[PDB]
Write a protein that binds this ligand. Structure first.
Ligand SMILES: [Zn+2]
Ligand SMILES: [Zn+2]
Ligand SMILES: [Zn+2]
Ligand SMILES: [Zn+2]
Ligand SMILES: [Zn+2]
Ligand SMILES: [Zn+2]
Ligand SMILES: [Zn+2]
Ligand SMILES: [Zn+2]
Ligand SMILES: [Zn+2]
Ligand SMILES: [Zn+2]
Ligand SMILES: [Zn+2]
Ligand SMILES: [Zn+2]
Lengths: 53, 53, 53, 53, 53, 53, 53, 53, 53, 53, 53, 53
């Protein structure tokens, strides 16, 4: 596998994957529990700008 | 090409990509004509998760 | 990384990336300001084909 | 790792790796429980035609 | 193979590699029928720069 | 290059590459201003384990 | 596909994949119609060395 | 070259590639003088499972 | 990911990654539990040769 | 090294690198002593098509 | 991008691609401003050796 | 081997690997006989800034 999940996202340091810091959704990761890598951004940006257009 | 179609999907070998055998949707791939790889699921899962949020 | 933006899109020659011919949607890259590569088409086809499908 | 098991075999969606459907060999994957990818077929073909010749 | 033709040039999508639309020189590839990728420019520029010298 | 700084390090979202929040050392990345990727840890752990041993 | 057939075998220049010249074994590729590359040899030797051992 | 011999097996530390130790096969690499890597094991497993099937 | 742990280290088959055999340092991996690949030696040697010089 | 000479050229089987069979140039490798791979062909074709033209 | 400029040439470290230090042709790379890698020499060699010979 | 020594270090043009010019220590590569690539500095800098924390 050329590109794996850990090529695409890093586990959030702030909320350590929980998506919420003590009741409140976590601001570092937008409630995702995960932060994008350069590679993940690259892929997501491409799809977003080209998908269905 | 780092990541080709054949790295994402396997042509279902029963119906040879058709999706049907003699009219009846193929009993292996079950329509899709294609079966996803670990790598294909990774990408799709990543996008499904992060797209538009 | 393994696959960058430049592996996925080329800068369109007609509009030079602006996507617009002084007001009018550029007819070459169809507004995008960019043209997809084999690799970019592969990714985008896969995602459109299987996303939420 | 360059080329993983998942790059070579996909799990069979009919029998989910069991190789059998209610006693009899699974007709999708032909009893193997697994379906080869283009990459897998490539390696195997090469070996089959050249090994011990 | 590591570097294929499709990694080096894009089929000009406007004319399907003809370089001409309805008698007219196609504006998206400039008659060439093909647009160079970042990768293709790199190799070509590198050979341009160092070959015979 | 096959492995760039951004393949190894991600920018710290909490401190924005500063390493400090209001003077006190930043808790999320523990002083660095940067969070390591799976690839970054793979590399770093290998080196720490075998270096000068 | 990280390693293709053409990464493994080259088409024979003497017999263009036929394996015989005039009816007699083709002395260039010794009947095979194909020549192994360094990569092909590597895989073949590895497998021949370890298989069933 | 995508996958080398050294990607597939490591030189045994006890017998430095020779198969024997003072006469009898080496207690570590069991005669082979080499130790398989994750990658080499993967290939060999795959071939043993599907070859002549 | 481009370079994984198993691309750098091989799990020692004489001691199952433990390091010690029946209390004594293992003759294969020399107590480490792990044997380095050519890839792993190349990184290590590069770092030990250039680090802090 | 991503692509080596062995990935580009194979040794000629008829002349075994000599480029000459009994005084007269080798009709197989046209005297070069070497045969191109698909990768070598694609690289060479690209450069010839685009080099300062 | 499989093979980048940086993979082919190194910026001469004393002059920073300038080719000159204070008017005088740079002693280190003496002119080019750049030093070829093994990878760069391999492609260049190949092209020089095979281009319309 | 994804990343070899020749992807990290380049032979110094001035001292041709010897690190020395007629006794006088080489100023191009400051004694080392080798110049680092962009890839080589990436890894060395990453290791230097994170090692021992
Ligand atoms: Zn979070
Ligand atoms: Zn089917
Ligand atoms: Zn345009
Ligand atoms: Zn099945
Ligand atoms: Zn066109
Ligand atoms: Zn921080
Ligand atoms: Zn032949
Ligand atoms: Zn041994
Ligand atoms: Zn051990
Ligand atoms: Zn010849
Ligand atoms: Zn210089
Ligand atoms: Zn020097």
């Amino acid at each position: 596998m050329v590109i794996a999940t850990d090529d695409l996202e890093v586990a959030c340091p702030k909320c350590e994957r929980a998506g919420e810091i003590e009741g409140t959704p976590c601001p570092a990761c937008s409630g995702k529990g995960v932060i994008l890598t350069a590679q993940g951004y690259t892929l997501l940006d491409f799809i977003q700008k080209h998908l269905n257009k």
